[PDB]
């Protein structure tokens, strides 16, 4: 919500301090209140993230060039639009791409996938790394040598070139037509999204640096950077719209074709694919826009010079002995084209009389002229013709800008006598009069008053009137002597409309605001773009400005601003005590409880910022409106003080005046819970000494006891014990704090709970025995005491088919496991209800806990209740790796006859029963086939995946031998004589392999 930031920085008053109230509104607009949030182990994260976003907003706003530097700001805004849209896509894609790490190592060559992941994260980190520097540091580090176009060099052609992985990856999705395919498809999808992000960001940053160094830096490398981003944009245009036959197909269109083939598959998958379908629209929009972009003008022009001998003037602003190098640029319909050349840079010892022999054109020409250094660099903005008049106009403008008024009057007289026509625009704006206003020169304007229409109301690029410009120049008497002409007094500027009264407030000019107020009866409480009065914009000046403006004239002392900010609010924020004092001493109709847009009063800001003197002054002086509920969910300043870990202010606010403790803040939150969350013994003891409730359960069913337990502090537990708190408590789930106490891992607090009658027998709606938590979190001592207390109740059953030793197992903590096994716990063969525990983990795809318990001495050769082998179970769900580690452990290589079955008879049956491709690939990794032809076994049930895989990993035809029409699986599948697997041939797999065999 950086738009709110812009609206609230329209008043330059307190940018960061007036950015804090949007964090306060986020506190007010987001449904934060719940026990996890109250623990504040979270709150710091969202608030720090909001502060970091605000820091990004500020350290990008301060880099921005104001207006009218080079017309390619249209290109820049096109950038920000399309770019930022790419991040609306990319932020949502990020949470999904976090999931792909779960299924790592399913392809042999996933190192390229992790390489692209680390590359994209590397530049995502660098974006914020560079994005927090200073202006000069920003430009220097974007000009940093030995890296330069580091991103361009990295993204040009690398060993991890996406074209190589592109074909094989589309083969992986072709497998998905029949998973790792989803994982790597989304890897490349995020890849192309971040590639378009790279392109937009790169062209944006080239544009920004071109503008930055084009503001009087140098036009030469400005044109160089112009060519640079033109080349980059057309390079991407070629890479994704290629008009070369001997070139790779565009990535975006091939991805699209994959999307149609996937939807043609008509199969189910994870919701990640659904997010992909949601992002399809964004991808196609980005495509269409990228081909519709092609921006700036594409051409340059040529011109010449000519010395006009009409008049001769001795001039010093036109410095003698300097070069007359000039150049022109194109500017039409809000676009620009840069050029840089002066074939005849001359150093004539004459006036500004040399005109330009510019060839006529249909495009408006901006003509600059150069001494050989950094100049205004804006002299003519013409359409058809001009004969050296622009140079005279530039001399007039810069002379007006000169502060030497005593000589400015003489030089302006001598130039206007020569015919220095006025009204021309400079720096793409009507300036000259405003340049004089900046310099504060008097006689120059008083003799230009011949053009009464101009000086009266001439606007600027942003509509800055000469009154607006002179209002921030300390030039009081000159404003006096130029005001008699009767200029408009409610006139404003174009963008971020402001009156000169509005703008004078920040610059602390009491004399100037006086000068304004004792002339006519001018409006004083006039608003502006964000709905602010000049009173609001004065307090940061922290001097006599506002103190004067309060009482010297009637004004908008209490006016509801559009942002909801009043002088009281600002005086609170920017920590201006004297302004608050003088505002209180006015004793006019200054309402104190005037709500803002958010819904919380200046006292609330004072508490949140944690300013002691403001709080006590507010509690003492006014004696009115010192504690009340807020607009939506009824906060108090004390609540804010507790939340933001400000203590001294908290007990000060308690001791200044009676503040009700029975308050009903959101979810009936009394500040006892908040104080417990902070964990300050003196604060909580003082609150209880104030007659506070001891065991008030909140609307979520939480009391301060649980939350205090989750706090690291250990004293307020005993404090709550002493102050009569129900030890046997019921949370939102009806849970008991023993669960949380064990979860955190405080042995001594747990012992105290046990001493005061806590009951281990307690549970929740899903009957969580505290042993479950005590083992999943993991610690020795809690287990020791609970055993010594009540024999673990033989580790009773949970909701799922779980025996607490199971959780202790997949936790894999050495000491507790050894303790449980030594003193008697669940063991592998006690799983008689179904198969054994080893036979049970492999069903749920266990990888490491099985191996670690085997090396923990657990037996291996047990036979399950279902006669079906542990190796076979490992094979059945893609876990033959455990069989391999059994081989290296030398458990047994199952080639010995089990009911006549050997290693080959164990590779056949399960790979027919289940489609574990990786297990077959591991079997062939342990290189052997034993003349097996699993293609024909698959075709016995006509499974196309396995027959295609055998074809691709062997190359032999699916029918190598011949017989009396019975050896071929095609005839077996089609004729289906003895009703064996015939009545269920309706499955398309029965005709799938038919074609892959007919084709050969």
Numbering used by the authors: 48 to 225, 233 to 348, 361 to 1066
Provide the publication's sentences verbatim.
Latrotoxins (LaTXs) are presynaptic pore-forming neurotoxins found in the venom of Latrodectus spiders. LaTXs bind to specific receptors on the surface of neuronal cells, inducing the release of neurotransmitters either by directly stimulating exocytosis or by forming Ca2+-conductive tetrameric pores in the membrane. The structures reveal that LaTXs are organized in four domains. A C-terminal domain of ankyrin-like repeats shields a central membrane insertion domain of six parallel α-helices.
We recombinantly expressed the mature α-LCT (amino acids 16–1240) from Latrodectus tredecimguttatus (Mediterranean black widow) (UniprotKB ID: Q9XZC0 (LCTA_LATTR)) in insect cells using the MultiBac system and purified it using a combination of affinity and size exclusion chromatography to obtain a monodisperse sample for cryoEM single particle analysis. The cryoEM sample showed a homogeneous set of characteristic G-shaped flat particles, corresponding to soluble monomers of the 130 kDa mature α-LCT complex (prepore state; before membrane insertion). The G-shaped particle is composed of a C-like curved region, corresponding to the long C-terminal domain of ankyrin-like repeats (ARs), that is engulfing a central compact head region. The N-terminal head is orientated perpendicular and in close vicinity to the tail of the AR region in the best-resolved class (compact conformation), but shows a continuous movement and is tilted away the tail of the AR-domain in less well-resolved classes, resulting in less compact conformations. The α-LCT monomer in the compact conformation adopts a flat architecture and is 130 Å long and 30 Å wide. The path of the polypeptide is clear in the density map, allowing us to build an atomic model covering 81% of the sequence of the molecule (residues 48–1066, except two disordered loop regions 226–232, 349–360). The resulting atomic model reveals that the N-terminal head region is composed of three domains: a four-helix domain at the N-terminal end, termed here as connector domain (residues 48–115); a central helical bundle domain (residues 116–352), and a short β-sheet domain, linking the helical bundle domain with the AR domain, termed here as plug domain (residues 353–452). The conserved helix H8 contains many hydrophobic residues and is predicted to act as transmembrane region of the tetrameric LaTX pore. The surrounding helices shield the hydrophobic surface of H8 within the cylindrical bundle and protect it from the aqueous environment. The long and curved C-shaped C-terminal AR domain consists of 22 ankyrin-like repeats, accounting for two thirds of the sequence of α-LCT.
